[PDB]
Structure 1
């Protein structure tokens, strides 16, 4: 109808159901609008800023905001939130002594952040040497998403001043140098970052002076769940709005984990498979990492669902989700990046997850060279196994810093198994993997994924 409780130019009936923006006006969603390229939006009819960002639902949906904001933040359920961190490129120490850093700022959010003023800590071993706020020489005027300051091809900015105006960074005593010579080196971490956001005033100009991102950080972090996606080299962090559990007046729409991922990362869905930029981010092709609360919530909710899939679990406020695209992934259909081919593989099957499976009759042993491996790193080998007989056990031998010999009992249906090991030393013993089964098994989606060192 024409009822607007929160006065954001979108009718309450349109917000409760689907709606789309055409010619800068909101209209009812129709299933025939998807082939033209339109997207269906849903938002709370009792709140103008469903996601908690400075931009209302209408501004996000109609694209009436800064054009450097990523389109993923045009969804009213996805918050435009800059994530900025400081990377320490180089360290210089020279005479007490003086210390200097070459650093570069990174942005992994959905919104640009003007006037970047990071605050950093200098910690050697537990003890924090100094806390430094960015001075006038170390302030970035612009920082667009998926971009750095200084940009690519430019040297990292210098940091040598402790306080305002002119100052020199200096350890308090010779003990710092004494423990530096022993073999202890210095970290750098970011405690907070200050910056501005852009709005259009009554004169049509863009102002970024009185608009502070710190006025919305606590609000966004309290009404949303965090989803992080790592692709080995690039990382993307997103916040998705979720409804309150015990609040009856909370009208935030409810979406699942897969729907939230698709909304936050704008991943193309080809019927059922989900692709980010041609890289499959489907549930069975990636590693999912959760904290204790999210893990227990998902385990509790899974038993009440017949499908029993992570992507079908309703998103809830306070969730932290990490997605790790496997470094090595083979499915015997369209991708096999392993430098060395597997042993005793039969592709003549039709019982696989997507197209076919691997009919293993005996054992499979793989020799992985360490040239394409990262030393001093923890890895996880994951896979999907199928055994209708449920009478054969699989024993696995993994070569690592400590030799691992483990046993597994496959189930009737496809079951995921993951084994964690650690590799230390580049010029060390070669990594060997072996798995032997009593009879004939089905294997699919074998992955090697890096974890924290």
Structure 2
């Protein structure tokens, strides 16, 4: 129920520009004697020229990387060079920039090597890629380029009757679209790697279709090799729940999940039914604060007491006080939109203190909805490498802990 399906991306490293200028120097000497008169002179000449159109060649340094569950024999991408709201050239890789093998979770070339270079647009490698003079003006003013992936072409391996395998005429393109017609897309992101899988779903409309269906929690348990331990889910000693990560849906799948959850008699998002086209992102958080165990924190929380600390569902400690954490900027990533999120309790007056500069310095009352356990989430923006401290401080009157709280990355969020 999980399809072998390699994903290929291209990463940019550096860009080398080259001006196709022309320079020249000349020197001459003149002597004359005529009948009495003489003449001796020296002439110098300095010259420079340039002909627009093929006035700036370029080359780019890329490397490839795989993520999925399959290799990709004889890989070939195509790229598009965008400069400023436009495109410059679309390049397919020729015979020189091709790649033989790509084992899943690796790179071409390997980790202990330097990147790859590409500079030509012709089918055989001649005639390097040019740049217009006004594009050279926009470039040397400071506006830099960026890259993309568009499509890839590669082969799989199958064995014939003689026991050897063949990779010739077996493309991967003619199985792309069909898979993307019948599957849901699940993307996990830890702090070291990423993973992207496709799991088939059940079209409930047409009744001849016999596909055994699952739920989204079952599909997460089935796709990744993840151990059910005491009912919860663990993956490479990492806890994964509906309560301990950050879930990202786009709005159409979010609306489907929304109007499907209202009719179900249980509030666990892992029990909703899977559907045909869904796009789910699971981001793990960096710093998790279960007050029973596993709090990877340098500084310690204040005003804690242990009567039934298990995370959610069992916290029953309700008293006055404050919790505070100061952690400097040095340990965390600069220039990124961090997200601080936790859960609820039933205190009466409780507010959050975030003194952090270059960010949301808004302090807000909690407005405790009920004694039922719901989330809360806020965001802020990271400055560049000061000793100024991250200071979180929860002042509460009638709760000393609720045992789920975290801060997370929220990546694809740069500053400038």
TM-score in same-fold range (> 0.5): yes
Q: Give, in angstroms, the shift of residue 222 of structure 1.
A: 0.7
Aligned equivalent of 1:403, options 361, 365, 386: 361
Q: Give the SS at the match of 1:86.
A: strand
Which runs of at least 4 in structure 1 moved beyond 4 Å after TM superposition? 354-360
The 5 A counterparts of 1:51-450 are 77-95=1-19, 96-350=55-309, 352-353=311-312, 361-387=320-346, 392-398=348-354, 399=356, 400-410=358-368, 411-427=370-386, 429-450=388-409
- The 1:151–1:352 alpha-carbon spacing in structure 2 relative to 1, beyond 3 Å, is closer
Q: Give the SS at the match of 2:331.
A: coil
On the 8 A contact 1:385/1:441 being kept in 2, the answer is no
Q: Matches of 1:152 and 1:99 in 2, distance apart?
A: 25
Q: Give, in angstroms, the shift of residue 437 of structure 1.
A: 2.2
Per-residue CA distance 1:310-330 (angstroms, 9 max, x = gap): 111111110110001101111
Q: Give the SS at the match of 1:99.
A: strand
- The 1:332–1:359 alpha-carbon spacing in structure 2 relative to 1, beyond 3 Å, is farther
Which residue in 2 is equivalent to 1:9?
Answer: none
- The 1:439–1:354 alpha-carbon spacing in structure 2 relative to 1, beyond 3 Å, is closer
Task: Say how many residue pairs are matched.
Answer: 374
Does 1 or 2 have the higher relative contact order (CA < 8 Å, sep 6+)? 2
Per-residue CA distance 1:255-308 (angstroms, 9 max, x = gap): 011110111111111131211111112221111111101111112222222221
Q: Give, in angstroms, the shift of residue 348 of structure 1.
A: 4.0
- The 1:347–1:171 alpha-carbon spacing in structure 2 relative to 1, beyond 3 Å, is farther
Q: Give the SS at the match of 2:103.
A: coil
Q: Give the SS at the match of 1:285.
A: coil
Q: Matches of 2:186 and 2:135 in 1, distance apart?
A: 39
Q: Give, in angstroms, the shift of residue 359 of structure 1.
A: 6.0
On the 8 A contact 1:360/1:443 being kept in 2, the answer is no
Q: Give, in angstroms, the shift of residue 143 of structure 1.
A: 0.9
Q: Give, in angstroms, the shift of residue 358 of structure 1.
A: 7.1
Q: Matches of 1:311 and 1:237 in 2, distance apart?
A: 18
Q: Give, in angstroms, the shift of residue 349 of structure 1.
A: 3.7
Per mean C-alpha deviation after superposition, the further-off stretch among 435-444 and 212-221 is: 435-444
Larger radius of gyration: 2
Which residue in 1 is equivalent to 2:22?
Answer: none
Q: Give, in angstroms, the shift of residue 381 of structure 1.
A: 0.7
Q: Matches of 1:358 and 1:172 in 2, distance apart?
A: 67
Mind listing any 5+ residue stretches in structure 2 that lack a counterpart?
A: 20-54
Mind listing any 5+ residue stretches in structure 1 that lack a counterpart?
A: 1-76
Q: Give the SS at the match of 2:302.
A: coil
- The 1:428–1:339 alpha-carbon spacing in structure 2 relative to 1, beyond 3 Å, is closer
Root-mean-square deviation over aligned CA pairs? 2.0
User: TM-score, with normalisation over the residues of structure 1?
Assistant: 0.78
Tell me which protein shows more helix as a share of its residues: 1
- The 1:117–1:352 alpha-carbon spacing in structure 2 relative to 1, beyond 3 Å, is closer
On the 8 A contact 1:347/1:357 being kept in 2, the answer is no
Q: Give the SS at the match of 2:339.
A: strand
- The 1:434–1:213 alpha-carbon spacing in structure 2 relative to 1, beyond 3 Å, is same
Per-residue CA distance 1:413-447 (angstroms, 9 max, x = gap): 22211112222333485432222223225411211
Q: Give, in angstroms, the shift of residue 98 of structure 1.
A: 2.2
Tell me which protein shows more strand as a share of its residues: 2
Per-residue CA distance 1:201-243 (angstroms, 9 max, x = gap): 2322211111111101100001000000000220000000001
Q: Give the SS at the match of 1:311.
A: helix
Q: Give the SS at the match of 2:147.
A: strand
On the 8 A contact 2:290/2:311 being kept in 1, the answer is no
Q: Give the SS at the match of 1:443.
A: coil
Per mean C-alpha deviation after superposition, the further-off stretch among 272-281 and 297-306 is: 297-306
Q: Give the SS at the match of 2:260.
A: helix
On the 8 A contact 1:332/1:358 being kept in 2, the answer is no
Q: Give the SS at the match of 1:216.
A: helix
The 5 A counterparts of 1:7-26 are none
Q: Give the SS at the match of 1:218.
A: helix
Which residue in 2 is equivalent to 1:67?
Answer: none
Q: Matches of 1:357 and 1:223 in 2, distance apart?
A: 46
- The 1:94–1:307 alpha-carbon spacing in structure 2 relative to 1, beyond 3 Å, is same
Q: Matches of 2:316 and 2:148 in 1, distance apart?
A: 46
Q: Give, in angstroms, the shift of residue 182 of structure 1.
A: 2.2
